[PDB]
Amino acid sequence: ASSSSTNIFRSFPIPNWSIKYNGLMRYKYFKDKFKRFSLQHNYRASYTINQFRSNFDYNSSPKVQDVNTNFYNEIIMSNVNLVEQFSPLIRMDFEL
Amino acid sequence: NKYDPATIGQAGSFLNSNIREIVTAKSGFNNTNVSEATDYSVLENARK
Amino acid sequence: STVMIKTAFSPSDETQSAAFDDFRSNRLIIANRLAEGHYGSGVAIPRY
Amino acid sequence: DEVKDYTAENEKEIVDYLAQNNLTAQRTNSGLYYIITKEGSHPTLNSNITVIYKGYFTNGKVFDESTEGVSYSLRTLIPGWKEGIPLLKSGGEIQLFVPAHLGYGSNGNKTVPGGAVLIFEITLVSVN
């Protein structure tokens, strides 16, 4: 929090990823009865403001604090959503 | 009028700070003939 | 799109949450940074 | 981060303005300059006031105005008003020379830039 952004919005999206690994089929699994083997991982996360809006209380008047003694904010929103999904966190699909 | 939430209990308001609490909602009025369902209504977990 | 895998595997239940404790502690840090942004270090930041 | 100090610049600008225009102003410990043109017959922190103020910049450009009386709680206002309004009574007239740290701060807002000196001509019509 000492250097994290204090802005409401973000400019650069952080990549989410999907990883597939059929790489264990060629080490020693030929004689380990494995005729198939794969690993799958997925990560997807989003940050959403469903509705922001400008504030009429944020104006040029000398009144700067609200009923909670907080400074008025130029942009106001009711909710913020952080959604994260490992779909799947890990998938092992193999056949003997 | 004197029900202005911005002027609650300043000098001549009709409301006290007790208007902010559900338990003391009725006592939050400075007038006499105020009824729990005519002049006002209260909800505890109202959904937007 | 964002990434928050750093707190994904921290235990979080009705009795403990490290990320929520960080949420609680970060409020004063953010408020101090915003105060420096508003009162620009030429005066002592007024407090409650 | 982007912490900017304007206290010395604001004080110098206020002094230069009070030199260019033949005005004598008292100074508080917070850096605010005020001229009490007239008084009345004292609002507190928990007091509603009615004002006919007009607020402009050092160049004379008006950024805020209320030609009709507007009511405020005096606890929701900028610190410059918070320390200037209780210096007179109903019917009094004041001229505030608020610096940035007592005005809108180092970031400011729309139509008021950061680190700006504000001049307010305030007429207190009521203290209730």
- In the stretch 1-48 of chain C, residues with CB closer than 8 A to chain D read 33, 36-43, 46
Tally of CB atoms within 10 A around C15: 6
Measured on CA atoms in the order A23, A26, A28, A32, is the torsion positive or negative?
A: positive
Give D88's DSSP letter.
Answer: S
Measured on CA atoms in the order C38, C41, C46, C47, is the torsion positive or negative?
A: positive
CA dist D103 to A61, A64, A72, C48, D100, Å? 11, 10, 14, 19, 5
Cβ density class A25-52: b for 16+ within 10 Å, e for less: eeeeeeeeeeeebebbebbebebeeeee
Give the closest residue to D15 by CA, choosing from D30, D31, D3, D1. D31
Q: According to the 3-state scheme, what is the secondary structure of chain A?
A: CCCCCCCCCCCCCCCCEEEEECCHHHCCCCCCCCCEEEEEEEEEEEEECCCEEECCCCCCCCECECCCCCECCCEEECCCEEEEECCCCCEEEEEC
Contact status of A83 with chain C (Cβ, < 8 Å): no
Per DSSP bridges, beta strands D62-65 and A81-85 are unpaired
Residue C14, phi then psi, degrees to nearest 5: -70, -10
Residue D101, phi then psi, degrees to nearest 5: -65, -20
d(CA C4, CA A10): 14
From the CB coordinates, do chains B and C have 3 or more pairs under 8 Å?
A: no
β-partners of residue D70 are D51
What is the total residue count of chain A?
Answer: 96
Structure tokens at D38: 């007239």
Nominal resolution in Å? 2.2
User: For the purposes of burial, counting CB atoms within 10 Å of the CB of D54, is it exposed (0-12), middle (13-18) or buried (19 or more)?
Assistant: middle
Per DSSP bridges, beta strands A81-85 and A75-77 are unpaired
Query: Are residues A65 and D63, on separate chains, in Cβ contact within 8 Å?
Result: no
- Read off the amino acid at residue A43: Y
Cβ density class D95-109: b for 16+ within 10 Å, e for less: bbbbbbbbbbbbbeb
Contact of D84 with D122, CB cutoff 8 Å: yes
A neighbour chains, 3+ CB pairs within 8 Å: C, D
